[PDB]
Amino acid sequence: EAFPLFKGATRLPTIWGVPMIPLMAMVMGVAVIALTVSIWWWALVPPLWFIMAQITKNDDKAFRIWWLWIDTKFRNRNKGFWGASSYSPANYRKRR
Amino acid sequence: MKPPQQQHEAFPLFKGATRLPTIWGVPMIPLMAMVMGVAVIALTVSIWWWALVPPLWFIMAQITKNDDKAFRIWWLWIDTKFRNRNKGFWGASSYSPANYRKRR
Amino acid sequence: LIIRGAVEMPVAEFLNRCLRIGIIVSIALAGGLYQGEIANAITTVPDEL
Amino acid sequence: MGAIESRKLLASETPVGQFIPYSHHVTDTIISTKNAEYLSVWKIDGRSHQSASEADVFQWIRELNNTLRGISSANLSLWTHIVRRRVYEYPDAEFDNVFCRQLDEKYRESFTGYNLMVNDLYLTVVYRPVSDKVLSFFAKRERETPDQKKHRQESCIKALEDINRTLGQSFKRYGAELLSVYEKGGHAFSAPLEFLARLVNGEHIPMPICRDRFSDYMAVNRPMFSKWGEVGELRSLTGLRRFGMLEIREYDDATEPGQLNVLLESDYEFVLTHSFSVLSRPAAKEYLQRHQKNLIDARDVATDQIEEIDEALNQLISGHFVMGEHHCTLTVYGETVQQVRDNLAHASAAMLDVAVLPKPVDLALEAGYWAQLPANWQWRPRPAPITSLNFLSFSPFHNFMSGKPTGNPWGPAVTILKTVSGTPLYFNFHASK
Amino acid sequence: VRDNLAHASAAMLDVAVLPKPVDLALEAGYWAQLPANWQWRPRPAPITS
Amino acid sequence: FLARLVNGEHIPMPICRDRFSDYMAVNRPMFSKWGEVGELRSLTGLRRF
Amino acid sequence: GMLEIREYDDATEPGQLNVLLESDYEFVLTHSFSVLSRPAAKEYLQRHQKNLIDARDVATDQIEEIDEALNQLISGHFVMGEHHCTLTVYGETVQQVRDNLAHASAAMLDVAVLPKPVDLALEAGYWAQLPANWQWRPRPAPITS
Amino acid sequence: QERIEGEYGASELASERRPHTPGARTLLMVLLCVIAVVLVTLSYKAYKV
């Protein structure tokens, strides 16, 4: 009698089976490469695009976790001094 | 007597049992053994001898299809009851209980 | 990625698929020996005739 | 020549230690192994099967599978062991009353020609640190610093101890008892080692905890296996015991609950065996996909083909069973080679009665006999993957009630009563908790 | 705390909701507990009410 | 309650003359670089989560 | 027929297997103590500890005990040596000899020692009873004094 | 001049290490051995052509 749960969960808006935001990141990166070194380099698209499709199909929301880690635990400066990433409780906003 | 029986409610058992990973219908490990053997023959006597592949390969396919795990039994026998040295002296293959590891 | 996060069959499927891709790519890249085959054809004609 | 040949033949033997994968007790309930595969033994008082509705054994299997599927790590394993045995431990009782003496002499006279044998079930849930054989192929060669060896040690001990707690809580109605070290006379006597030694020796030799690896001194009976045959022979002090192994290789379109009950009522003393090397969900799904592909590469059978494997795969993804590699080796014990063959034919008839076509093991007798000791996958003759529901249907831990002959608070059992089933009950007032 | 985490994982698996310990987004999750923080949630997956 | 979410303790939070974001955390948290567990360095004692 | 009593654990009683002094069968129970020079004992203990360390399973109930004994040897002042033990029960009927062996095995399992029956080493065992027959000892292993 | 006794120093979390599945190293090494011999033979033909 359990209330049905449908597997439309985390069926993210995907084109070709890949979410918009990370695929746009790849488009920007490959465009940068093409404009920087050589123009033959829109062949870098299909390999990494296919690997991203295989990553997304297995684990639908890997990229959100990636971005969260990159934004927070990768930016925090004094990881080495404390032995761990820490944020000061008292608000030292560099003011006096 | 009649301990619990079936009434078509029995838990299904599918025949994916011992459907071993097979290429062309033959398991990897024995087919690799045949490849090694035929390669040895080809490198040893003559190079016309990769025609020795299809006959024994087909006989191995017919063996595997009938009895899926013959080769594991073959290897187990070869490793254990064929290696044991004093089969003749005892009248049977026997392993000493006391650990005589040749030490003193 | 497969050993950390993605769907994987570690030893059988991944190694076997990598082997298939590698063998096919190696054969296809053996085409880089084109002069060998062009000479093979140009000499197959006279030897037989 | 005639003098030196003793040592020459001596030193040129393969000791049984090469085939027994055990070592020091690491925890009072867990035994190590040369490959560092810690295991524990579970003595089980299997619940009755005769006195229950047919649907209720289904319900028992449902509960048992539900508890299993929570903890069935891809690193697990199971060896059930229903060691049918005859009772030599029931001392004749002294008496003073003439009326009582007459009554007891008459009663024990009434047992001439009766199956005096008691079932003894078991379970050894094993824990390999690493599942995939391909990486373990390297791991068997590397060198590890002692501190990380210790780290693996506590990781495995904690994991297996959680498994033991869960199984204990799941066997509340099965009267299970985890076997553990007990001390006799200022020395450590192992409780599991006696069972595994019974597997090796065929007797019950009380195994002490000495200062060596158990593999060195855990076999006190020189076994002998025939060159061309299915039967063997154990040369012991108390007498020869000839054993003839057997093997299951052909299932059917059924996993009816407790189909292997017929070997409980046996007239022949044996040791059944099982194995369930729990298997990863991707690998199990691949095996089932292989069966699906093979089936669908054929004529379209109406129902056996399509919907059955539809629901099979959908359950497997939805987490309702866990496939595993399985093998069952009934080994009958006997005193003469003709009699053990007769018992083997009887057991084959019994298995064929319940639609599991058995074929006696002939070339791999020694491999099978070394495949009974828990933590031996490399010696199993025919591991064939099956559904987990199905394995728990090949070992529902059914058992006829038998009671405990000795070890009671007062001593020996008070009386022995006829049972309509046939297996005798060793009556005693003191029940368990 | 790791022992308790393994216990909680066993408990959740008992009721058929496969849990996976958060490893890369520990800090994002820990900042996703305070109400009015959607930008920090690791895995928002739509479900029926 | 929300401070209990942040701190791990029950510190009675008064209404002072600032934004709550400024003075609502009295425990310096510490998150591991590679892991799932952390540590709250407080006066009354460490709490690992 | 014979029995080889190979025991390593320190005895519980100062006389452990003295249950054999009262039994219904004859025997000649034999022990040898071929001493080891002190450096040889040190080297043996070191090699044993090393080979126990360099294994795939860690057993801290063994390594620490052996390492305790290694410098107990220097300071406890007892000198080690080789030691084999063999019990040669006599009889009249061969089945009677096997019954004697079973009785002795039980009566020594009662005292926490496990007898290992002798099957092919009997000639070596018997010719090892003579003093100065070091060569024919089946499988001696070092034992504390 | 030494760290002050009985205080909270650096974290105890830096002691954490990522465990390795004890098959990855050996088979990874052998896989790279075979792929490398393929690639070297391939560049042998590359230069030879």
DSSP track, chain B: ---S--SS-SPP--TTTT---EETTEEHHHHHHHHHHHHHHHHHT-SGGGGSHHHHHHHHHHHHHHSTTHHHHHHHHHHHTTT-STHHHHSSEE--SS---S--
Give residue D363's identity as a one-letter amino acid code: L
Longest dimension (CA), chain D: 80
How does DSSP classify residue H19? P
CB neighbours of D164 closer than 8 A, spacing ≥ 6?
A: D29, D40, D42, D125, D178
> How close is the nearest chain A Cα to the Cα of F31, in Å?
5
> How close is the nearest chain C Cα to the Cα of A91, in Å?
37
Quick check: G113 and D208 CB within 8 A? yes
Give residue G139's identity as a one-letter amino acid code: R
Residue D118 is encoded by which pair of tokens? 């008691």
Strand partners, D177: D43
Q: Give φ, ψ of H25 to 5 degrees.
A: -65, -50
**Is F23 buried (19+), middle (13-18) or exposed (0-12) by CB count in 10 A?**
middle
Strand partners, D233: D224
Residue C41 is encoded by which pair of tokens? 């054809």
Using CB atoms, pick whichever of H23, H31, H49 lies closest to residue C33.
H49
In whole angstroms, give the CA distance from residue D138 to residue E17.
35
In whole angstroms, give the CA distance from residue D274 to residue D390.
12
Closest CA to G31 of G88, G103, G95, G73: G88
Closest CA to F32 of E28, E21, E26: E26
Q: Is D216 left (phi over 0), alpha (psi -120 to 50) or beta?
A: alpha
User: Chain E contacts of D319, Cβ < 8 Å?
Assistant: 16, 18
Helices (H), D72-190: 98-109, 133-139, 146-170
Q: CA separation (Å) from D319 to D285, D311, D312, D427?
A: 11, 12, 11, 43
Q: Are D75 and D131 in contact (CB under 8 A)?
A: yes
Closest CA to B85 of G45, H2, D11, D127: D11
Expt. technique: cryo-EM
In whole angstroms, give the CA distance from residue D323 to residue D431.
38
Give residue D121's identity as a one-letter amino acid code: L
Strand partners, D277: D325
In whole angstroms, give the CA distance from residue D224 to residue D365.
11
Quick check: E10 and D71 CB within 8 A? yes
What is the 3-state secondary structure of chain E? CHHHHHHHHHHHHHCCCCCCCCCCCHHHHHCCCCCCCCCCCCCCCCCCC
Chains that touch A (3 or more CB pairs under 8 A): C, E, F, H
**Residue whose entry in the numeric block shows the structure tokens 């990486």:** D135
Residue H7 is encoded by which pair of tokens? 């205080």
Residue D96 is encoded by which pair of tokens? 């003073």
In G21-78, at which residue ranges do the beta strands (DSSP E only) sit?
A: 30-31, 34-35
- Chains A and F form CB pairs within 8 A to the count of 30
* Cα Rg, chain E, nearest whole Å: 13
In whole angstroms, give the CA distance from residue G4 to residue G120.
12
Closest CA to D32 of D175, D149, D123, D199: D149
Q: Are D207 and D190 in contact (CB under 8 A)?
A: yes
Residue D123 is encoded by which pair of tokens? 């379970």
**Residue whose entry in the numeric block shows the structure tokens 């040596």:** G81
Give residue C8's identity as a one-letter amino acid code: E
Residue H4 is encoded by which pair of tokens? 């002050």
User: Chain E contacts of D71, Cβ < 8 Å?
Assistant: 10
* Cα Rg, chain F, nearest whole Å: 12
> How close is the nearest chain H Cα to the Cα of A75, in Å?
18
Closest CA to D49 of D273, D264, D252: D264
What element of type H or E holds D277?
strand D276-278
> How close is the nearest chain C Cα to the Cα of H38, in Å?
8
B59-B61-B63 Cα angle (round to 5): 70
**Residue whose entry in the numeric block shows the structure tokens 């379109």:** D253
D7 inside 8 A of chain G by CB: yes
In whole angstroms, give the CA distance from residue D419 to residue D429.
17
Quick check: E24 and A9 CB within 8 A? no
Chains B and E share 3 or more Cβ pairs within 8 Å: no
> How close is the nearest chain E Cα to the Cα of A82, in Å?
16
Resolution given for this structure, in angstroms: 4.3
What is the pairing mode between strands F28-31 and A85-86?
Answer: antiparallel
E5 inside 8 A of chain D by CB: no
In whole angstroms, give the CA distance from residue D394 to residue C21.
42
Helices (H), chain H: 24-48
User: Chain G contacts of D208, Cβ < 8 Å?
Assistant: 109, 112-114
In whole angstroms, give the CA distance from residue D33 to residue D128.
10
Quick check: B99 and D217 CB within 8 A? yes
- Chains B and G form CB pairs within 8 A to the count of 19
Closest CA to G5 of G126, G110, G105: G105
Q: Are G141 and G6 in contact (CB under 8 A)?
A: yes
Q: Are D347 and D330 in contact (CB under 8 A)?
A: yes
Q: Are G89 and G118 in contact (CB under 8 A)?
A: no
CB neighbours of G61 closer than 8 A, spacing ≥ 6?
A: D24, D25, D26
Quick check: F48 and E1 CB within 8 A? yes
Chains G and C share 3 or more Cβ pairs within 8 Å: no
**At F31, is the secondary structure helix, strand, or coil?**
strand
In whole angstroms, give the CA distance from residue D382 to residue D363.
12
User: Chain E contacts of F38, Cβ < 8 Å?
Assistant: 26-27, 30
End-to-end CA distance of chain A: 64
User: Chain G contacts of D6, Cβ < 8 Å?
Assistant: 120-124
Sign of CA dihedral C38, C40, C45, C47: positive
> How many Cα neighbours within 13 Å face the side chain of D362?
7
Give residue E21's identity as a one-letter amino acid code: P
CB neighbours of G41 closer than 8 A, spacing ≥ 6?
A: G73, G79, G80, G142
Q: Are D385 and D281 in contact (CB under 8 A)?
A: no
Quick check: D185 and G121 CB within 8 A? no
Distance of CA D224 to the CA centre of its chain: 22
Quick check: F30 and A82 CB within 8 A? yes
Give residue C6's identity as a one-letter amino acid code: A
**Is H7 buried (19+), middle (13-18) or exposed (0-12) by CB count in 10 A?**
exposed
Q: Are F6 and E34 in contact (CB under 8 A)?
A: yes
Q: Give φ, ψ of H36 to 5 degrees.
A: -70, -40
Distance of CA D240 to the CA centre of its chain: 23
Chains F and A share 3 or more Cβ pairs within 8 Å: yes
**Residue whose entry in the numeric block shows the structure tokens 């020694």:** D366
Chains A and E share 3 or more Cβ pairs within 8 Å: yes
The residues in H 19-48 lying below 8 A from C, measured between CB atoms, are: 21, 23-24, 27, 31, 35, 38, 42, 45-46
Quick check: H8 and F33 CB within 8 A? no
Sign of CA dihedral A22, A24, A25, A30: positive
Sign of CA dihedral E32, E34, E35, E36: negative
Quick check: D70 and E13 CB within 8 A? yes
Quick check: H18 and F39 CB within 8 A? no
Closest CA to B64 of B92, B86, B39, B33: B33
Interface list for chain G against chain B, based on CB atoms closer than 8 Å: 4, 82, 116-121, 137, 139-141
Q: CA separation (Å) from D110 to D104, D114, D178?
A: 10, 9, 36
